Curated annotation (Swiss-Prot):
Zinc. Can also use cobalt(II) with lower efficiency, but not copper(II), nickel(II) and manganese(II). The active site is at H62. This is Carbonic anhydrase 2. Disulfide bonds: none annotated. Changing N60T: Reduced activity. SMART domains: Carb_anhydrase. Changing E115Q: Strongly reduced activity and sulfonamide affinity.
Amino acid sequence: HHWGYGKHNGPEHWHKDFPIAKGERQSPVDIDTHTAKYDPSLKPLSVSYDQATSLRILNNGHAFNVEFDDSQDKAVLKGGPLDGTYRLIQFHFHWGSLDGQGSEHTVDKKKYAAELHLVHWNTKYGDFGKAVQQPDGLAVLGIFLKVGSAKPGLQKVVDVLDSIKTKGKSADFTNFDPRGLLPESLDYWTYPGSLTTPPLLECVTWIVLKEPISVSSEQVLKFRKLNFNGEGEPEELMVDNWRPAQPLKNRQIKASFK
Ligand SMILES: COc1ccc(C[C@H]2SC(=O)NC2=O)c(OC)c1
Ligand SMILES: [Zn+2]
């Protein structure tokens, strides 16, 4: 599979190798704030990242992933719409060429500069590969980025990017605290969806925070210096690595807040 984000291999082409691209619960979606309904049944959201163990940062030619040790319940997401325990395995971002685009989810059609995805898997399925074959296998916590003041908790990530410029490069990335990427409020929207890259599996409970985080123009500029290509290949800047909004179809987006 040679999927990407260019004219010739981008989102509009994915359906040929991955027919689920036109399925019934695809992500991302536009979040219409005037349609999403407060759900009093949602339990409190619990982000328990105190024992998180980051390992490594990898440029995979699509984004960069910060990977965690998920061999035990060290960093978990629970509560909200979720039944049981979801283990943090990695986070990554999607971003734009310009500050007015980059997010995958949109809010009343507004695009943010970027979007952070913290990917977790349901521990009742034993491993990640099994979890992605289930409708309730993953929980992705999505956080919007806007350009304003610098995010201090992001700078350790920004500073390692020079060392993973091209596809297939990785670097040791220990002792990174993902709590420094969260906004103040955990108010969220939730809906059932999919992975936003191939293989596009319909296995995700999306939890999208309402409050964006602010990052500096300098921070996001350094994201944009990454490369999609491998070392020694013609430079293709890693920008606009986002899938656009997909049809909502027969789904409701629930709000955790009034
Ligand atoms: C096979 O299971 C997976 C799971 C998650 C991703 C990451 C995707 S899903 C998302 O929300 N954003 C992304 O980039 C994946 O990518 C190959 C593959
Ligand atoms: Zn993502």
